[PDB]
Amino acid sequence: SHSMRYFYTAVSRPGRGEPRFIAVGYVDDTQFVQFDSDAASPRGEPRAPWVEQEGPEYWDRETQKYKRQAQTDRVSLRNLRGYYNQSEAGSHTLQRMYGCDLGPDGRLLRGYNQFAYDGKDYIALNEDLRSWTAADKAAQITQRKWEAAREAEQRRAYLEGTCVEWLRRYLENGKKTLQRAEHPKTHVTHHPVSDHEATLRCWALGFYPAEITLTWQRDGEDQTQDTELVETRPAGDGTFQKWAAVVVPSGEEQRYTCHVQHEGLPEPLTLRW
Amino acid sequence: GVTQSPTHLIKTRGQQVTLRCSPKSGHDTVSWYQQALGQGPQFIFQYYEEEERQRGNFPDRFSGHQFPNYSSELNVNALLLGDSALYLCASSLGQTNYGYTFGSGTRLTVVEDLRNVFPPEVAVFEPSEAEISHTQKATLVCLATGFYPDHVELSWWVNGKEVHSGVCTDPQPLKEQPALNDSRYALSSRLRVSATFWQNPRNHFRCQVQFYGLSENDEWTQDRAKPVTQIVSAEAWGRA
Amino acid sequence: AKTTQPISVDSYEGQEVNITCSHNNIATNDYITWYQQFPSQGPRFIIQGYKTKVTNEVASLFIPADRKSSTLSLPRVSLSDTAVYYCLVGDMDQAGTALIFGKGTTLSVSSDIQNPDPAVYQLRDSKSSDKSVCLFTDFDSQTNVSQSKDSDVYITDKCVLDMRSMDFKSNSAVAWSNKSDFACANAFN
């Protein structure tokens, strides 16, 4: 299930001037656009080759929306400070996430449009794309405001229509990267840590997309409670990395097997030391 | 719906105007357009939340206003003859193009002098007996002549009630002197009825012309009658 | 994505009318909508679409796969469909560009007169016995009414009326003049 997702961050700054507005847009785990209100002359900027060849009208219209969104978020931050009776002397953060998931019929599987204030849920469009869930009494002020303005109908029109159509266009123009999974390249390393013990570390490198599962088994049964996992992390080139480690008694290494599940793999992998 | 006022207005070169528009109920965005004769509407500006949010290719003497209740003003000063146009208002919700709804427009004519304005003369011409004998139908013809500017609405009334069946009015007026930029106009209309209906002397036929002209506050100095907004009519009874 | 469309389309009552519109520069965040403007009115919404054929009670809208054109289809036109038709490509993004109009297409609708009987009649004033008018009537709809060449003779264009209860339609034009030897038998020749 492919997705397109936008991430807006608006941060007020007392005395330094206008709030800073940063936007990033992704298709699946691939970023394709960035906007930063603090840039020299702020403009939507390509981050993936399948939008770099879009013409000047595309980038002009994207830039105009980001500029207007920054101005509206500044008003929102001011209103929120009033809702919570907070100080001008403090900096505050307004975050927005929205986008569409592509369904098997090529239309919307689900749409979302969610907000957070200072790191906590503030208000969210419900999956019906018609009604809102407010997190506290302050967000109920916004909800009544957005209900009166029929904000949800405006957002629903984008999420069900324009969002899906952009996503389908991107998936076609970036077909050779966005619709081609990159299988993880795997190997196991061995490091004695104590002197009847050794760390077996199972590595997964260079895979796309980021979703992956790494599991250690001792005698066919999962060693979940003794497995250290790191969070999946970016390699910096568009691919991701992850590893899982267990401390095993020296001489028992050949019992342990690492198991790899990923979209780029026709069948799950089994590795041993 | 969208409410625009006034429907018609005359101003002289160099004057200023305020046109007004109230959006359709449930709409809070207002867009103004200028439509000159034979052209499509040209975008002036759009107002939302009491602020001008975008503007077309129009000079600063075109200015706008939007009240908290979403109603809007189009203000134009230093009027020129080229400002003569149908000024259209369109309303929508939160600056979306979906559901865009237009008013009927304000017809504004800028004239060189107040004495350019002339009311219409109206005459009704009774049916030809040759037509009646040959077709057993009877066509009445109405002529509204000598008026300026083209601010007229013509209607037919039979026994005190407006009729539309059997009526047809020129879609465009004739320029009485086509080489003159401010030529006065002529407009013709026909109402065709059965011969027996026209031959009933109790039937009353009226051609009625509404003319939108000068206001009470326009100062008239000429010897001829002030060409105010007025209703001019010509009529005939049936003839046995 | 500005639109371009024919200056005019001519038609007869009861036929299907198609008006095509070109918009090669349409974008993914643009939709297609058509308005009609009757005399004495503002433009009025007809139909809208994105990429799928649309049909409502007033028209159909055809959009080919590349969306670089669109066709408005009016099923069985009547005289009351005479209007200017505007094809618009509109920004779908909220607070984007307001609707921008192109030139538009003037649609005229003629009637196929049954038993035409073209004739010129002289009418006499209701008040005056001095002023008079000539009426060219009952001619077929392909008749061209030439404009006046004499500077003191006035000739209006043709116009169709509908005597509804009698199931009868007829074209007519009017000529008049103030001069001495103006006669009707030669007014329209």
């Binding site: 939507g44 209103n79 929205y98 957005w146 984008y158 | - | 607070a95």
Partner: peptide
């Protein structure tokens, strides 16, 4: 392609 701009909070 980004969404348009609606009401402030």
């Amino acid at each position: 392609g980004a969404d348009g701009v609606g009401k402030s909070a």
